[PDB]
Swiss-Prot record:
Compartments, record wording: Secreted, Extracellular space, Surface film
Additional observations: Pulmonary surfactant consists of 90% lipid and 10% protein. There are 4 surfactant-associated proteins: 2 collagenous, carbohydrate-binding glycoproteins (SP-A and SP-D) and 2 small hydrophobic proteins (SP-B and SP-C).
Protein name: Pulmonary surfactant-associated protein B
Subunit structure: Homodimer; disulfide-linked.
Disease tied to this protein: Pulmonary surfactant metabolism dysfunction 1: A rare lung disorder due to impaired surfactant homeostasis. It is characterized by alveolar filling with floccular material that stains positive using the periodic acid-Schiff method and is derived from surfactant phospholipids and protein components. Excessive lipoproteins accumulation in the alveoli results in severe respiratory distress. Respiratory distress syndrome in premature infants: A lung disease affecting usually premature newborn infants. It is characterized by deficient gas exchange, diffuse atelectasis, high-permeability lung edema and fibrin-rich alveolar deposits called 'hyaline membranes'.
Function in brief: Pulmonary surfactant-associated proteins promote alveolar stability by lowering the surface tension at the air-liquid interface in the peripheral air spaces. SP-B increases the collapse pressure of palmitic acid to nearly 70 millinewtons per meter.
Domain of life: Eukaryota
Portion held of the full protein: 208 to 278 of 381
Disulfide bonds: C1-C33, C4-C27
Species of origin: Homo sapiens (Human)
């Protein structure tokens, strides 16, 4: 009478995630024109 321990380890595999590069430098940083 347990098994539920399997659903829990599942959440364990779904905890991943991140992202976030933010490459706006050259965009508004250059605008040399000259």
């Amino acid at each position: 009478c347990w098994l539920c321990r399997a659903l829990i380890k599942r959440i364990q595999a779904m905890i991943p995630k991140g992202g976030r590069m933010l490459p706006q430098l050259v965009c508004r940083l250059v605008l040399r024109c000259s």
